[PDB]
Design a binder for this molecule. Structure first.
Ligand SMILES: NCCP(=O)(O)OP(=O)(O)OC[C@H]1O[C@@H](n2ccc(N)nc2=O)[C@H](O)[C@@H]1O
Ligand SMILES: NCCP(=O)(O)OP(=O)(O)OC[C@H]1O[C@@H](n2ccc(N)nc2=O)[C@H](O)[C@@H]1O
Ligand SMILES: Cc1ncc(COP(=O)(O)O)c(C=O)c1O
Ligand SMILES: Cc1ncc(COP(=O)(O)O)c(C=O)c1O
Ligand SMILES: [Mg+2]
Ligand SMILES: [Mg+2]
Ligand SMILES: [Mg+2]
Ligand SMILES: [Mg+2]
Lengths: 615, 616
């Protein structure tokens, strides 16, 4: 997979005259957005994790772009006025360390050119098109292996015309080295070298193939004629082509699997791979390194924590923790104030772990005096509890409970399955030793990877615990990968590709802003609940903001099924209540849901409720 | 998703003169394949499981087509000479029970059209294109909501030209009902009604939207002019469009995950769905009902068997069996003649199940005499064993071992992780009570679903047993789905969509033909092994044909790393040996690997082996 890209954007764009006197031409806007920002989104959407933008003229526009996209690094060609495009690539190259995509800044293009270059086996590969009749075409001459032998804007300087250079090229680091060595040795005589020229030179000794997509839909914008072609013809075509790959968007109001981006969905599609290959071990290592960061404050040293990934669900991860972190020499206290706390107590009981339960209401907060009293008996070495009790939307105050458990010398075992990545978390100041979550809740990937983020020292303390199971044993799963850079058994390979994409998108959003978008959706729902006269099971002060239990209207005209089927006709999936003794329904707002989508849902809810005489 | 399609294929193709005298025009060939078989392939590749073809003219071409694609059912309009296309749709209608794609038979098209209709939220939807300059165009007139209000081959008879009808339309069953009711009402006065006519009438009371894809690449073939645009321009363009979506193909010579079809890859891409929804409960039910049939002979009663699916790996599925099927009141005998037999023994011991181990060589066949003497001690209520020991490619003779165990009163627990779907199996005659496998080995899906196919009577016996774990407990996982039509926990939804496609493609290939394909590759590999002077660790007669353990060459110039890195440069992934005291490398041939591709590998293997002095 290609993880890096370079956008060459130091040019003056002089041929656009007034348009570029104050502005790089990448920041021309078609359809409401800078063309280069669209390219940045297309690159990240295909799993590019680092975008090196070589800046020069009006570099401020790009520095300000980088503020919106953490994947961008800007590097200025201070001499941009007196070099060509090769000089800008030269200041970028020290930032490139593997194979990469190389893009011009004045392009619009069908993103299927990204996919097609990434998925071609040839390592050095120019994307080319058929005839465009656009002006300023760079023509490629190719040999019988379709490899580059000449290039020129004068079609008569060439021995054949294979296609036109699009400006999107896949290259190895070694090919870049060769280009930068030829550019450097010609700093005096060829000061305005264009990157194409150095690539042609490099192609003499390293084969550089050309992939000719006859009908590839693209346009470069050097001047006003190009812009006319872009605005009137090429852009609406690109829009249509990219919408052909759009996936049916169902808005899920259940707490996960939730609505996903289509870039997370398509991240599941990749070359087949043997998961014991080094490259896949490096991907699993990167997933471990990056997952645990979403649970730590930036000032907490990451090396104090480990991630342990398993092929299993959230319940699986909870069972890993209960069944691997509490020796028979200790005693566990489980907080049961919901289905997931009750589940952990039943797991501990199945395993015959010494254990008492602290039972409390599913919708009103825990008594912390009574809880501290149970810590104070010194009977408990370990505590297992849930952060967000998805049963009702109750948020347990683990910023209070778990540091208190630590003050009593206890190890903390935390189900954060529906909390992690939806709100900021710092395991260190939260006093949390082991934390479980999954790949398909608030991180917004696909189901199938459960994981435990561990205080490394407390993880180590379990090295000599008797195993209670095999597939779900925390220490062995951790120890084997530390030793072999392989995971013990076959993992959900494609789901792990999806998880990496969801990790990149969580870094792009940041957890803080995801929390704000979740809470904005929640704010809309609660206001509409109040207007309709509906009642909330949990008091707002005590809620997670990620799911809201709503009491069922008393009128016999209501049923869950009728509201559910109506909402489903409008592409909204709602969720039943989970309590035997109290009738509720639940509306969650996680995943890719947008505030306007929750607004549209409340409109439909009001339609339905009004139709049965509620509100 | 959309599970059903209909092809109207009854007409004469008269405008094609001699080419259709003896043949339906759907069987015109471009690129070596009948255009209508090309359409069937793209339908099947997008998850369609039933393709109803309405026949008439020379219906025998379509009946022979149906022999090659089991998803096809042909139904002949006997009166095709005296109806139009709606009459053929009429005789197909009772075979359609859901929303469906409706297709003309003379089409070539970008398959993106299937994907785009399936993923559009509007339930009744005509695919349209911009102007084609093709002749015989069917023009569509649309209202301000892009819904159909008129159509004609005569441009001037319409108040507006919204686009051209491609001939691929998504409809509900209720829209089909309406169309058929209107056609029967007009049997007398409109006996040659075209299906377009009836759809326009339905659109007067049911909104039928039009999805206009301006640059959509397609062509219908009614005459020689159409055929020329198809051959010279449209078909090469579709080929290019479809190859832009191709995923890089690595040939995996490791035993799973292995090379997959791109249709299985893209089956993971779907509408987000809450797994407790009835629709997804129905999918998991379908998967259970279909997975167990690849482990049974047709003469075996599928009602005697259940499937229990989990979100775990093959080791997880083995652990499900070991930890849920043997109570402390019994005693388990584990056969250990390989890594996965040993693994089941290690799991057994961690749970403290009463057990002995029957150890044997990892590359000599087990002594059936010694094993029977162990069974005859009457000390064991349960046997656990491995069908295919992918450690070495050693295939245990379970068609002897497990019925013997049954004759001795034993319950049988079988890891068939690397055996199931690569060779015909019948659990009834094999005497197997519990059989595990996964979604990413010989069934050729994506990893994440581990499952246990159970003798129903024996599965129900385990209700009495104390739970030893929770996530991996067989009975509780079975019973919950039986009671609720939901799985206990969140499953790997998208992996299950891919498993469904892999199931559909196994049904298309058949397990017998897949065994032949695998064995075909294995033969090629074995013949090249011998030509090079390489030695196999397991005797041919005791091998599975699915993975071959090869002795590493003695020369210091050999290394697994060099051979692996050279192979990988040519898009082949090989696998290291697994054995403590014998140096081997392994070459598997499961997954979508083709024989020509195994031949290409042996050519590169000879290049490497000759390079270091092996093989003359
Ligand atoms: N294949 C090129 C057709 P064109 O001649 O229009 O090249 P450009 O003038 O559009 O420059 C190509 C890219 O190269 C960039 N560039 C140009 C000059 C320079 N000194 N540095 C650059 O990065 C520039 O910003 C732009 O994105
Ligand atoms: N949008 C269609 C306009 P066109 O005039 O090409 O219609 P065709 O003659 O090509 O037929 C359309 C389809 O309808 C089928 N058909 C036609 C006549 C008939 N009695 N039964 C059919 O199924 C036929 O085999 C063919 O595949
Ligand atoms: C708090 C909590 N814990 C555990 C789980 C179990 O997750 P899974 O269904 O993936 O087992 C969930 C499910 O919603 C959850 O919300
Ligand atoms: C016979 C056998 N049993 C068990 C396994 C373990 O399966 P998994 O890697 O999915 O855990 C394998 C996988 O190679 C196998 O071949
Ligand atoms: Mg130019
Ligand atoms: Mg340019
Ligand atoms: Mg026609
Ligand atoms: Mg036709």
């Amino acid at each position: 997979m290609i993880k890096q890209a370079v956008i060459l954007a130091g040019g003056l764009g002089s041929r656009l005259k007034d348009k570029t006197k104050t502005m790089p031409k990448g920041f021309l806007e078609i359809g409401g957005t800078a063309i280069v920002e669209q390219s940045v989104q297309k690159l990240l959407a295909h799993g590019i994790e680092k975008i090196v933008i070589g800046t020069g003229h009006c570099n401020e526009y790009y520095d300000n772009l980088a503020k919106k996209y953490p994947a961008i690094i800007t590097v200025k060609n201070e001499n941009y006025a007196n070099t060509g495009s090769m000089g800008t690539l030269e200041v970028c190259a020290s930032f490139v360390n593997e194979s990469f995509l190389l893009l011009e800044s004045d392009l619009i293009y069908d993103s299927a050119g990204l996919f097609s270059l990434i998925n071609d086996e040839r390592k050095n590969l120019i994307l080319a098109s058929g005839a465009t009749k656009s002006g300023d075409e760079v023509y490629l001459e190719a040999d019988e292996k379709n490899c580059l032998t000449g290039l020129s804007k004068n079609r008569d300087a060439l021995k054949n015309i294979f296609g036109e250079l699009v400006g999107i090229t896949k290259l190895t680091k070694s090919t870049l080295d060769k280009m930068c060595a030829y550019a450097k040795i010609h700093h005096s005589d060829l000061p305005k070298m264009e990157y194409e020229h150095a690539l042609l030179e490099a192609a003499k000794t390293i084969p550089v193939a050309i992939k000719r997509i006859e009908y590839f839909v693209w346009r470069e914008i050097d001047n006003e004629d190009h812009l006319e072609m872009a605005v009137k013809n090429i852009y609406p075509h690109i829009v249509e082509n990219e919408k052909l790959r759009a996936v049916r968007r169902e808005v899920l109001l259940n707490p996960g699997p939730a609505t996903t981006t289509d870039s997370v969905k398509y991240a599941q599609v990749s070359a087949d791979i043997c998961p014991r290959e080094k490259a896949f071990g490096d991907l699993m290592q990167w997933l471990c390194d990056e997952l645990k960061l979403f649970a730590l404050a930036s000032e907490t040293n990451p090396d104090e924590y480990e991630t342990v990934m398993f092929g299993c669900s959230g319940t699986g991860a909870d069972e890993v923790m209960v069944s691997s972190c509490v020796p028979d020499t200790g005693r566990l206290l489980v907080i049961d104030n919901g289905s997931y706390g009750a589940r952990m107590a039943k797991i501990a009981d199945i395993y015959k772990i010494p254990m008492d339960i602290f039972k409390s209401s599913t919708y009103e907060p825990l008594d912390l005096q009574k809880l501290e009293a149970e810590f104070a008996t010194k009977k408990y070495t370990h505590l297992a509890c849930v952060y967000h009790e998805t049963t009702t939307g109750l948020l347990n105050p683990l910023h209070i409970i778990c540091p208190m458990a630590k003050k009593y010398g206890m190890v903390t075992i935390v189900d954060a399955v529906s909390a992690y990545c939806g709100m900021p978390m710092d395991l260190k100041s939260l006093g949390i030793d082991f934390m479980a979550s999954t790949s398909n809740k608030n991180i917004q990937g696909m189901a199938g990877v459960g994981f435990v983020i561990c205080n490394k020292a407390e993880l180590e303390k379990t090295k000599d615990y008797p195993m209670r199971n095999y597939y779900l044993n925390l220490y062995d799963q951790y120890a084997y990968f530390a030793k072999t850079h392989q995971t013990r058994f076959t993992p959900p390979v494609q789901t792990m590709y999806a998880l990496r994409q969801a990790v990149l998108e969580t870094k792009q959003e940041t957890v803080q802003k995801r929390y704000e978008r979740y809470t904005a959706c929640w704010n809309i729902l609660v206001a509409a609940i109040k207007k309709l006269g509906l009642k909330m099971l949990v008091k707002e002060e005590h809620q997670s903001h990620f799911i809201t239990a709503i009491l069922e209207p008393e009128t016999p005209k209501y049923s869950f099924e009728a509201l559910h089927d109506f909402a489903a006709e409008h592409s909204f999936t709602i969720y039943p209540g989970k309590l035997g003794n109290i009738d509720t329904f639940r509306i969650a707002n996680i995943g890719d849901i947008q505030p306007e989508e929750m607004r549209r849902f409340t409109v439909k809810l009001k339609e339905y409720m009004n139709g049965i005489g509620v509100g």
